[PDB]
């Protein structure tokens, strides 16, 4: 099984400070073949689900403060293309989920 609900992934943030061991970055994902048109994730990194990205807040819509930075992890991904089912959650442990990839959050931690 794998943890990647938005309850999963967030209780898993708070305690451990750190992702599930089925989250990749953009980066590292980038590193075994993924390409985001291709829809492949899945096809070059079996089980794994995009996260730990940052995420830059540019429009505000989360707070800020000195030191936070904040940072992404996908929700509900198994195949295919990525979804629109976000965590953001920042370097002080405030976590907020979207379903609408980042035009509304909701704060859970």
Same mark, same amino acid.
């Not at 061991?21 to 995009?50: E, H, M």
């Not at 920042?90 to 909701?106: G, Q, R, V």
């Given at each position: 099984? !794998?943890?990647?609900?938005?309850? *999963?992934?967030?209780?898993?943030?708070? /305690?451990? &400070?750190? =992702?599930?061991?089925?989250? %990749?970055? &953009?980066?590292?994902?980038?590193? =075994?073949?993924? !390409? $985001?048109? &291709? *829809?492949? =994730?899945?096809? !070059?990194?079996? #089980?794994?689900? %995009?996260? #730990? @990205?940052?995420?830059?807040?540019?429009? #505000? /819509?989360?707070?800020? $403060?000195?030191? /936070?930075?904040?940072?992404?992890?996908? %929700?509900?991904? !198994?195949?295919?293309?990525?979804?629109?089912?976000? =965590?953001?959650?920042?370097?002080?442990?405030?976590?907020? &989920?979207?379903? @609408?990839?980042?035009?509304?959050?909701?704060? %859970?931690?």
């Amino acid at each position: 099984a !794998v943890i990647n609900t938005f309850d *999963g992934v967030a209780d898993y943030l708070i /305690r451990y &400070k750190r =992702l599930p061991d089925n989250y %990749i970055t &953009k980066s590292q994902a980038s590193a =075994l073949g993924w !390409v $985001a048109s &291709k *829809g492949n =994730l899945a096809a !070059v990194a079996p #089980g794994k689900s %995009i996260g #730990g @990205d940052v995420f830059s807040n540019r429009e #505000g /819509r989360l707070p800020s $403060a000195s030191g /936070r930075t904040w940072r992404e992890a996908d %929700i509900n991904y !198994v195949s295919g293309a990525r979804n629109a089912d976000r =965590l953001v959650y920042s370097s002080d442990w405030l976590i907020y &989920k979207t379903t @609408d990839h980042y035009a509304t959050f909701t704060r %859970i931690r």
